[PDB]
Ligand SMILES: [Ca+2]
């Protein structure tokens with residue numbers, strides 16, 4: 001039996017799926033700890049920029065979880081992604097430990113822009129700026145990639161890099177009450193929010209686990225971007241990003257929530 005995680009329902013993905021929008025033909029790169037082979041995922045390709053982990057398989061669990069929020073297959077098992085038909089690429093930029101070097105992250109973005117990815121999911125971030133990272137974000141953006149990044153989990157009124165950068169779409173986390181999750185970073189540069197508490201998704205060992213974080217929020221938005229891209233094949237990264245913000249549900253202060261809660265039903269109308 002397949003279940004629909006609360007976050008998926010919250011952003012109204014099923015509403016879009018019922019119009020025939022599933023992210024078909026949209027390439028989405030997950031820059032994380034890898035993506036493990038799993039019955040509820042369809043992994044098309046990828047690369048590893050982590051020396052010592054040549055494989056794209058996930059030794060952490062984070063990348064697998066993020067991947068399932070975007071594209072867990074619509075079938076009779078497991079869960080359901082926001083864009084269950086999206087073409088998923090495992091881009092390993094973090095090791096099993098869940099940490100990585102900036103250069104691996106920049107190489108992953110370069111890779112995304114060189115392989116014609118439409119969306120890059122970066123559920124990672126640092127409080128410090130990086131010239132190398134910035135340049136990578138900007139290069140992937142002028143290559144047509146929509147870069148989506150987590151705002152950070154420190155609960156402070158400033159957001160992490162790369163989410164803070166103008167060309168990155170910064171995502172914060174909401175709870176079941178449509179309030180900002182206590183850990184969700186907010187402030188200047190925040191674009192939008194999505195569910196980030198108790199998020200059930202795919203996990204290594206062919207199972208399912210529930211996590212919390214802005215890392216869980218991010219994929220909801222990467223998935224919503226694929227739905228819009230499928231509907232509007234001619235739109236650029238920028239047009240998609242503005243549309244998502246334009247159709248978000250206002251939740252209160254823009255300092256805390258940016259545009260509001262992503263809404264895939266409204267964005268695919
Ligand atoms: Ca499934």
Ligand SMILES: [Ca+2]
Pocket residue numbers: 163164165166167168169170189190191
């Ligand atoms: Ca931003």
